[PDB]
Design brief:
homodimer; about 425 residues; alpha+beta; Cytochrome Bc1 Complex, Chain A, domain 1; 2 domains; 6-stranded mixed beta sheet; 5-stranded mixed beta sheet; 16 helices; about 45% helix; globular; binds zinc ion
């Protein structure tokens, strides 16, 4: 709904301004880089650069970035996913200059020293060690994508394999950074109470001078997942866990597909909200699961509709899967009430306008669509969403929720 | 009883192994082993080790493309090649009179092979055909490939040496030149000569053609570091293919690396379970119940963490799950320790006969040495026969219960 103005610099750095209205803004730097741009053996680098991006540059010390942003009362965070690496500072419009100055300092001026690479690697090694190896939901998450994808880089989670992390080199990281953190592969997004013309010329002051690597184009990943040809399963026995978990995922179209809208709605009906089907049946009523939810991941390439449930003590994961399937079979039968379709539709209207208030929520929307160049899909989202009928939620259900596209993972003691 | 040998390492790190056979006349085999396979590849650039097999018979400094074969055939020789997970292997079958020319031809392709773009481009289309025909559109081939995709997740054994189609499709000449010049160094190669020929003649002739060949640099060949995590439970995958009509099954159990002590028992287990016309899979699945048209086992002795593999293709109107239910029932029967003394004895008497039959053929002896040389495990090879004949039933049952657990099982169904 909100209007936007975009301009492209001579180096390829796309600048996008979204005027919003109380001085509060968020300045984003997006990199069209994810773990999907990695290769098995040298994975996890996409996430490693997130840690390294806040290290010493030419004019900044090893922690000077996080200290300068703290000085004008701003907040800074960063995240790397499958398809995008995103940095952002949320502050007032008064600090729009220094924020752009800071981000430019880390783009075309960032140097990765050895005495910074070594200490940070063993840190990420611990992040792998304690958030995937010795973590219930984390291990299930990683092992699922190991099973659901065989060839495409979605074979692994942005954290990457442990041995990969252990065998990184400074050269490997510099090559990955220099190639993928080029101005041509980046986007500057500013959202909040700021002037679009003011943002453009001020972005030019810090980014027009920065240059790219060569003239060649960014290497495009070619590892396309072959169509899934039947159910894949994997059971994971791991000491350290006590409860029994299960992940059920169905193969789902790429980002720009028309059916992604109905899927998003299916997620909010099945396992998203205090009144979802999973929460009501498995958690509330039958009390089989302590936690149960769904998430229609909107990955750039061939994505996946994900179910995750961690049952109560002494409850097998085969019972969880059997009951989730039971719900899905009731779904494919067309058992959706008008009230359910209505409640999800009115809750979407509510959640939408609530996000238009905060600049941080708005920038999150565009960021996911800017990197895909599907802004037209963003603007037409609500109109296509509210015009959804039960027929649409059932067509999509019977379309992608087949066992032949299913990937099931059991987590047992 | 195993043939004595003499080894010599050249100044460039090339190993030369001569295995004379007096009880043979004229016939020899000239082997060139490269310590390279699909295990030295990376996903995105897989199947390259196999591509090099095709390109190895193209033009060199002195030879035109295919002139290698023409020359070999001219002196009535036979030259085959094969790439596996761990080892790339070339050999010429001929007489000792052609030992010199054979060594010349192999030196001609080792440190003198030029990889022209006009040779790489058409040959890739060929190996692209080899992929679609014998994997993308082949029952046993697709099953073989999809199995290793499931059984292994991280280690390069995730794929068979044919590689992924898109990998093949996205190769570059630079990629292949990098791979070849790195992995086909003399320091990474072994020249093996078996048959009726003098060792000192083998050495001086190999020194003649290979001693002057240079390496790429001084730093050692990169060792793969992607070790497969211990399998933490059963893994399954169903493959629906249009071309198929009968249902197939692949049941594999994780197994120790090449140089392990239990490998001999594993070999013995395969001899008992699914090899020969007297195996359990034959006279129970194929014969007594007529459930499968084909059924066999293979203890793959891969360099890194290996796999014991059961493969069965059912008769019409027989589901793949029915095949799995039966082979498991055999394994449970096996794990109960139900092996007759008569059964164990038949395995040992057949192993004797095959061994003495192999000592008569230079081709057989070469094949034995080739696998153990690339692993530097000749001691294991010599000690094999005695270890095999000292196997008790208990050894077979211990090894069975040790590795044939569902938590290390990988199962792939081929439908419809
Ligand atoms: Zn992190
Ligand atoms: Zn989304
Ligand atoms: Zn071939
Ligand atoms: Zn063997």
């Amino acid at each position: 709904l909100p209007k936007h103005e975009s301009v492209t610099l001579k180096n390829g750095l796309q600048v996008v301004s979204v005027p919003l209205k109380t001085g509060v803004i968020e300045v984003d730097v997006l990199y069209k880089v994810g773990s999907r741009n990695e290769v098995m053996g040298k994975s996890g680098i996409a996430h490693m650069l997130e840690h390294l991006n806040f290290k010493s540059t030419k004019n900044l010390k090893a922690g000077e970035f996080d200290k300068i942003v703290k000085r004008f009362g701003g907040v800074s965070n960063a995240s790397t996913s499958f398809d995008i690496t995103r940095y952002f500072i949320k502050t007032s419009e008064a600090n729009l200059d220094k924020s752009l100055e800071l981000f430019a300092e880390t783009m075309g001026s960032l140097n990765l020293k050895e005495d910074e690479f070594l200490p940070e690697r063993q840190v990420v090694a611990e992040e792998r060690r304690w958030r995937t190896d010795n973590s219930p939901i984390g291990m299930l998450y990683f092992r699922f994508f190991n099973t659901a994808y065989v060839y495409h880089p979605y074979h692994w989670t942005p954290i990457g394999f442990m041995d990969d992390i252990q065998n990184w080199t400074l050269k490997d990281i510099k090559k990955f950074h220099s190639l993928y953190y080029q101005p041509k592969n980046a986007i500057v997004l500013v959202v909040g109470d700021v002037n679009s013309q003011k943002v453009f010329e001020l972005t030019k002051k810090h980014f027009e001078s920065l240059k790219n690597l060569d003239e060649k184009a960014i290497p495009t990943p070619y590892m396309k997942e072959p169509k899934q040809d039947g159910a894949r399963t994997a059971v994971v026995h791991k000491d350290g866990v006590h409860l029994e978990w299960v992940a059920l995922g169905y193969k789902v179209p790429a980002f720009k597909h028309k059916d992604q809208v109905a899927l998003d709605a299916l997620s909010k009906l099945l396992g998203e909200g205090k009144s979802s089907w999973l929460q009501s049946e498995l958690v509330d009523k039958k009390r089989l699961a302590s936690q149960a939810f769904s998430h229609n991941m909107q990955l750039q390439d061939e994505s996946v509709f994900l179910f995750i449930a961690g049952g109560n003590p002494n409850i097998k994961a085969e019972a969880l899967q059997k009951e989730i399937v039971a719900l899905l079979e009731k779904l494919k039968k067309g058992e959706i009430t008008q009230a359910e379709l209505d409640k999800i539709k009115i809750n979407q209207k509510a959640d939408f306008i609530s996000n238009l208030e905060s600049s941080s929520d708005v920038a999150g929307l565009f960021a996911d669509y800017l990197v895909q160049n599907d802004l037209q899909g963003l603007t037409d989202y609500q109109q296509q969403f509210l015009d959804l009928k039960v027929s649409d939620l059932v067509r999509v259900a019977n379309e992608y929720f087949k066992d032949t596209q299913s990937t099931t993972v059991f987590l047992k003691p």
